[PDB]
Amino acid sequence: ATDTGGYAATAGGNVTGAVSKTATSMQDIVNIIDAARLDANGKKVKGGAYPLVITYTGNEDSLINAAAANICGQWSKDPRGVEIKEFTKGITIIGANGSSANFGIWIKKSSDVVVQNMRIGYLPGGAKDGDMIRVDDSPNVWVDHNELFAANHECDGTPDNDTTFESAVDIKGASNTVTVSYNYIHGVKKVGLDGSSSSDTGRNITYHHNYYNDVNARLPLQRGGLVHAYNNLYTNITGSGLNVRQNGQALIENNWFEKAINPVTSRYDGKNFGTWVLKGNNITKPADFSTYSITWTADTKPYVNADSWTSTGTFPTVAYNYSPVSAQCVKDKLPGYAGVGKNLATLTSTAC
Numbered sequence: 001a002t003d004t005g006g007y008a009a010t011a012g013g014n015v016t017g018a019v020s021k022t023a024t025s026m027q028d029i030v031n032i033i034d035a036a037r038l039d040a041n042g043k044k045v046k047g048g049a050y051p052l053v054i055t056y057t058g059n060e061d062s063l064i065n066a067a068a069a070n071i072c073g074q075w076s077k078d079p080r081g082v083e084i085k086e087f088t089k090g091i092t093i094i095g096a097n098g099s100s101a102n103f104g105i106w107i108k109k110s111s112d113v114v115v116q117n118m119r120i121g122y123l124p125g126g127a128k129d130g131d132m133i134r135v136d137d138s139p140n141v142w143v144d145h146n147e148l149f150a151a152n153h154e155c156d157g158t159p160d161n162d163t164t165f166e167s168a169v170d171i172k173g174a175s176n177t178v179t180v181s182y183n184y185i186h187g188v189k190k191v192g193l194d195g196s197s198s199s200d201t202g203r204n205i206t207y208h209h210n211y212y213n214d215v216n217a218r219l220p221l222q223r224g225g226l227v228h229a230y231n232n233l234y235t236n237i238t239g240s241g242l243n244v245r246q247n248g249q250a251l252i253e254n255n256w257f258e259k260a261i262n263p264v265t266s267r268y269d270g271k272n273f274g275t276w277v278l279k280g281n282n283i284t285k286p287a288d289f290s291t292y293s294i295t296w297t298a299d300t301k302p303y304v305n306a307d308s309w310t311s312t313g314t315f316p317t318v319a320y321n322y323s324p325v326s327a328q329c330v331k332d333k334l335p336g337y338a339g340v341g342k343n344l345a346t347l348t349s350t351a352c
C-alpha cells in the first residue's frame with residue numbers, strides 16, 4: 001500500500017497507470033522524467049503527466065573505483081546528479097541488482113518519490129553540494145534499501161575543511177514526512193541534515209533499520225520537528241550521532257549502539273536543546289557504556305549529552321504502524337536486510 005514503516009506514506013510510481021521504463025544511464029533517467037511531463041498532445045502537464053517506475057540498470061563501478069583510489073580529487077569536480085523537480089505524479093527509482101551510480105538524486109519541490117536499491121558512492125563535487133540523496137521541500141519521500149558510501153575522511157585544503165564529500169541523505173525545507181529505511185551507509189563524514197539552518201525547523205522523519213558504519217556525524221543533525229529512530233545499527237561513529245537541536249524531539253527506540261562517540265547529544269548551538277525519549281536500546285544505563293564502547297566528549301559551548309541515558313522529554317504518539325524487533329536481533333540480523341540486492345527484504349520478529 002503506502003506503508004513505509006514511518007512518517008512517509010507513499011507508493012511512489014507504483015500506482016494505477018504507472019509507466020515502466022528502463023534507464024541504462026544517468027542521462028536516460030533525465031530524459032525519461034522529461035518525457036513523463038508530456039501529455040498525449042505533447043503539451044506539458046504541471047507535476048508530471050503520468051506516474052513512473054524507473055529501473056536503473058547502469059553501472060559506474062569504474063568511476064567509483066577510480067574515485068576511491070584518489071579521494072582528495074573528488075571535491076573540486078563538477079557535481080553529478082539527477083534532479084526530480086516539481087514532479088508530483090508518483091515516481092519510483094529502483095536500481096537493478098548489480099547497478100551502481102557515481103551520481104546523486106536530488107529531489108526538489110516534489111512529493112511521492114521512492115528511491116530503492118541504489119548503490120551510490122564516492123560522488124564528485126563535495127564543495128558544490130554533491131549530495132547522494134537530497135530531499136528538499138518534498139513530503140512523502142521514501143529512501144529505502146540503498147547503499148550510500150564514500151570515505152570517512154577529510155582531505156586538507158578543502159573549502160571550510162568540510163567539503164571532501166557531501167552528504168548521504170540531506171533533508172531540508174518543507175519535506176514534512178520522510179522515511180529513511182534499510183540503507184547501508186558507510187564511510188561517510190556528514191550523513192545527513194534534517195533542517196538546513198536554525199530557522200529551517202520542523203518535519204517528521206523516521207529512520208529505521210539503517211546500518212551505519214564508519215560515519216562521523218549527523219545521524220541526523222535535527223533542527224526541530226520529530227524524529228523517530230528505531231531498529232538502527234550504529235557502529236563506529238567517530239564524531240557524534242543524533243544531534244537533536246532547536247527544540248526537536250526524538251524517540252530513540254530499540255537500536256543497537258556500539259563503538260560510538262556522543263551517540264545521542266545536543267551541541268553546537270549552545271541553547272534550545274532538543275529532547276529524547278530513550279526506549280529499548282542495547283544501552284539501558286550508563287554501566288553499558290563501557291560494555292559497548294560508548295564515549296562522550298564536551299563542547300566549547302553549552303551542550304547536553306545523554307550520558308545519564310535517561311529520557312529528557314516526551315514524544316507524541318507515533319502516527320503509524322510499526323513493529324520493532326529487539327536491539328539484539330538488529331545487531332544479529334540487520335546487515336543481511338539493509339542495502340542493495342536483498343530484494344528489499346524486511347526484518348520481522350519471525351526472522352529473529
Ligand SMILES: [Ca+2]
Nearest residue numbers: 131166167170
Ligand atoms: Ca548537501
